[PDB]
Amino acid sequence: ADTIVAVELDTYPNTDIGDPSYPHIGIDIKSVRSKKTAKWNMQNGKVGTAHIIYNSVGKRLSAVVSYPNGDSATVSYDVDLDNVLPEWVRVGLSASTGLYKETNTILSWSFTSKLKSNSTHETNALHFMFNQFSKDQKDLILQGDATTGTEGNLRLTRVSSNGSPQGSSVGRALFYAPVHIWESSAVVASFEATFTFLIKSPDSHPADGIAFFISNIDSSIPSGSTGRLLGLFPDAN
């Protein structure tokens, strides 16, 4: 039903729905079966940064994930998003835990979108930055198990009062205002997103991952989308 473009930080290989056989970062165009992936060493308990970049000129969606020691994974995919997404969208973050589990903690999130016309100067633009999340975060739409705490963090999936990640959890956070991410007459339609995160588990394996996504304005968690579907897709096709 929904239309999804996503960058996934996938901690758990589900090798029978196309995942490679290692943790990986991927670009998802209307399917959980990534159009392109790269091997990712998730560092348990450390704070990672993800950077996502697209412009309508180069037409290349790119995504790098790094940790402070310097190890990083990158994935790029050539795609014209004018042909995938509706003109108006909501942008958001998603995360899942299923049979295996992890914290899906967001410490900060920023986004910029710009439409530059022909036309001579300038420009429609939207920019937000969160370095601290609050308990009543009025410019965020929280779906499912997602919560904003008193500790300044966004917590996408269930965590218990002792700091333990729960299994079978799904949560999303979407920015409140719709975003105008393309316009047929824009000479440049570009966007960038950045988020920092803390994934930790005392579990045999961490699962399932975190994703930045762009969707139709009325997007909601699809029925049965915990575990490997990352709160983004109603099936694995």
CB 98 within 8 A of CB 182: no
Which is nearer to a second copy, 110 or 168 (by Cβ)? 110
14 binds Ca ion (CB under 5 A): yes
Candidate segments 107-115, 146-154, 193-201, 223-231, binder of Ca ion by CB under 5 A: 223-231
Neighbours of 210 (CB within 10 A): 27
205 binds Cl ion (CB under 5 A): no
Candidate segments 40-48, 94-102, 181-189, 222-230, binder of Ca ion by CB under 5 A: 222-230
235 binds Cl ion (CB under 5 A): yes
Which is nearer to a second copy, 100 or 128 (by Cβ)? 128
Per partner kind, with CB cut-offs from 5 to 8 A, the member of Mn ion, a second copy, Ca ion, none near residue 236 is none
Candidate segments 14-22, 61-69, 82-90, 157-165, binder of Cl ion by CB under 5 A: 14-22
Phi first, then psi: give them for residue 51, nearest 5 degrees.
-125, 130
Which is nearer to a second copy, 17 or 53 (by Cβ)? 53
Spell out the residues 6+ positions from residue 215 whose beta carbon is closer than 8 angstroms to its own: 2, 3, 4, 5, 89, 90, 91, 92, 174
Residue 14, annotated as binding a ligand? yes
Which is nearer to Mn ion, 19 or 145 (by Cβ)? 19
Phi first, then psi: give them for residue 172, nearest 5 degrees.
-140, 155
Per partner kind, with CB cut-offs from 5 to 8 A, the member of Mn ion, a second copy, Ca ion, none near residue 79 is none
Give just the sign of the alpha carbon dihedral 148, 145, 95, 198: positive
Q: Which two tokens stand for residue 149?
A: 């705490």
Partnered with residue 111 across adjacent β-strands are: 128, 193
